Symmetry: C3
């Protein structure tokens, strides 16, 4: 047959024609995501980042990174490091709003939530005090928290305290999405698929078309805490850090 | 013209509205009520994917004369999108589903009753193709022509409007690249088909990258996070994209 | 250090670790944007417009325009002129819905709200009866309203009566966003960053890849007032006006 089998799970065919009660994980993700949108003013701003230099740095230093630090070098610790630094530099984004008292709380800790796709459903463990971590420590924290999310070895403190979230919306091919932030958080950054795209490049003041590894970074922000220009300035810092790609010293090889 | 103002997609009949207050028709009043309510009782988000429609465009160009001669309807892109989406809803029963927030139970529908958004002068109408999973591309093309005609001429039947399990809306009919369409519970998804645009893209032939002109489309999927999470939305769209990019539809046209 | 300094305000570092009451402007923005989403059916339709001809017209006529009219010639009066003309042609978009009486009011005035980013927060002054204005008058109104927004010299009529809004979401680098409309308004058009992108061009029936100055125009519309097709037709008129770029007479040189 001409039907597509790509990303199709044959085991899900049994679901067809049935009514089944969902598990607690999914039941929580359902009542809480519906509520999140009603108690915040969410909007998603889109920026594109040229990941070609980070890709070249990753390709070059990955073998030594694996040998020294024991874990693989993916794109996620680069996104995490750039976002965590920008949350320190943009304290108005690493913040929570209280609609009753009209007070803004600017968190001194950057407790970064990481969305982890598991067979049981979406889980969002937190990297507490991520501002004190190096790229190797971030890479080991991701491996640890993702493993414990999939094998149900997460403590109650591992799921609380998050001040910002990062989610890989490009894990299943998406260019972008409008991820849902969960108050008290004021932002959630999605990392779209890193795709080769023709872009205009300027070298010595002359424009040319070149193939570059481009990513869309959609930021869902709460308009109660962050304005459009605030969201753009925060994303400009992240984009500048990633496009400059001065991370060789951060890898601690 | 005597002025530099644009006349493109301007309806001179709408000039009568300017400076007036009028009660909206029954279609508009319900669409206003339902869309406002829909967002308050669901967790909507729109995931975007791009699909290379060049092979479907080449197949359509080659087989359009024979399709119109045999089946009597024009061959548009919509039956290809409908066929790919209906097959993907069978393969992804978790998307062809409804959530009950009171009992926390998920119902996975055995029928794919595909809602089609039809723009009419009186407003938006959404007739349903019941049991679309049992239809061929020629039957789909005819059902679209029939339901669109009866929507515009107020001749829809009671069943033509109920039972929808998923919706497909042509947001590219009036030039849009993409949109964040509003899904209406009990449905869990609405796929929009953006405009098919010639865009320069990277093509990797035999391990070598090159820039080529391809007919690209954005397929925004609005999904309910109560029913579908980000990864399921991506897997569902990956199946649709793979079916459209492979473009093995020559037999499906039944010529 | 390798940290990015781009768009980082060192003065905001003082906020980190504190709880402070937000100012009147920010408290009202937070109240209005959370409420706006609950009393409307918002969705954002995206179109791209080739601004290359407007860029070439601007470059060519800017010296004469500044000399005659006394004000700079930016892209904003071209966007304002195209949107205001389209709101006259599409009275269904320059409208307000009353959900209690089910009546649509089609405004005869195009009172265009302009989003102005200020250090004290977002302000949205209104250009009343913008349909009667020329591009030189529009350019002067923008300079005046933006100045008085930043220097807190806006009067009560300057902030009321808006029938549509235009916001420069590309001011801090964004390609696009899903801006929040505020009822009674039914639409808010965002102007993304004007970026040089490689696009396909058809000259004498032959396709080629060329560098053009492209912009994304996201329109947030209220589905109570405007359908997807209505939004597309309204944006098609705007796109046609901008891509044709017949503004030489409008510059009143």
């Amino acid at each position: 047959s001409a039907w597509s089998t790509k990303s199709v799970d044959p085991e899900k065919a049994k679901l067809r024609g049935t009514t089944q009660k969902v598990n607690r994980i999914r039941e929580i993700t359902a009542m809480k995501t519906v509520e999140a949108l009603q108690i915040s003013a969410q909007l998603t701003q889109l920026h594109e980042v040229d990941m070609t230099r980070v890709a070249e740095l990753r390709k070059k230093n990955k073998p030594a990174f694996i040998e020294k630090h024991g874990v693989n070098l993916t794109y996620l610790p680069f996104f995490v490091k750039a976002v965590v630094e920008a949350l320190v530099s943009h304290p108005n984004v690493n913040a929570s709003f209280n609609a009753k008292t009209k007070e803004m709380t600017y968190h001194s800790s950057v407790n970064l939530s990481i969305a982890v796709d598991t067979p049981a459903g979406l889980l969002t463990p937190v990297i507490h005090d991520a501002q004190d971590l190096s790229i190797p420590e971030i890479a080991k924290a991701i491996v640890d928290l993702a493993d414990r999310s999939r094998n149900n070895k997460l403590k109650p403190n591992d799921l609380s305290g998050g001040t910002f979230t990062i989610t890989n919306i490009g894990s299943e091919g998406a260019l972008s999405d409008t991820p849902i932030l969960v108050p008290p958080q004021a932002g959630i950054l999605g990392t779209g698929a890193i795709v080769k795209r023709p872009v205009v490049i300027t070298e010595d003041g002359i424009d040319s078309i070149a193939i570059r590894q481009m990513v869309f970074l959609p930021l869902t922000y709460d308009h109660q805490v962050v304005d459009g220009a605030d969201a753009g300035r925060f994303l400009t810092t992240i984009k500048d850090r990633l496009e400059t790609a001065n991370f060789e010293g951060d890898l601690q090889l």
